[PDB]
Amino acid sequence: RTTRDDLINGNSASCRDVIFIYARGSTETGNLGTLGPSIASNLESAFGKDGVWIQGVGGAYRATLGDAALPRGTSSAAIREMLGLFQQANTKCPDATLIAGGYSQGAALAAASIEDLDSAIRDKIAGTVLFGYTKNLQNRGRIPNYPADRTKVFCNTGDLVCTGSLIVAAPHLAYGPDARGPAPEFLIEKVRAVRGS
Numbered sequence: 477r478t479t480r481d482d483l484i485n486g487n488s489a490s491c492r493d494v495i496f497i498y499a500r501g502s503t504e505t506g507n508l509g510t511l512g513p514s515i516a517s518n519l520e521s522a523f524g525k526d527g528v529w530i531q532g533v534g535g536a537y538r539a540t541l542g543d544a545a546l547p548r549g550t551s552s553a554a555i556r557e558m559l560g561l562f563q564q565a566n567t568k569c570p571d572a573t574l575i576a577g578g579y580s581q582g583a584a585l586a587a588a589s590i591e592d593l594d595s596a597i598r599d600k601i602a603g604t605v606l607f608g609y610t611k612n613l614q615n616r617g618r619i620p621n622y623p624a625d626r627t628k629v630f631c632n633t634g635d636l637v638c639t640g641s642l643i644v645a646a647p648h649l650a651y652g653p654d655a656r657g658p659a660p661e662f663l664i665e666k667v668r669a670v671r672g673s
Contacts, residue, residue, distance in 0.1 A: 484529050496519055
């Protein structure tokens, strides 16, 4: 359940209407980690199995704990990997609506990638969810160059990474309920706002 490569494996002749690109947290397994699968199952319920492609950020993104201390909150190699996936989605399925998300180091990776992304592709990301956003204080709860109305941050009280630290405390591991309900609820609402239906 922790590995999904729907975009990479998918046939361009039968593109999904929605493509979700997600970055896992530090030390998590597969390319979806602990929260990704929960969001994925709810997206599948809303758009149908063939209506949405779930794609985790794998490849060069090793989710190494130490990389969270680098300038952008992740490595340059990881940012190149996620940028490449957004570019692949744009090329393979020009008409698909994109949505993204990330947890912990993956949240910093999603923010850094979206910030560097060509505006024409970035503008196709209808909504982005960030859990335990490591650059929450630094970026004042925003993703640079990306609208606030398309952003939803889940930062628990007591989760030190949300207040400028890199210390991992218990609240940082309590995003399960958010991944099962409000996060997919937000993503679904943002997709329907632009796609109708």
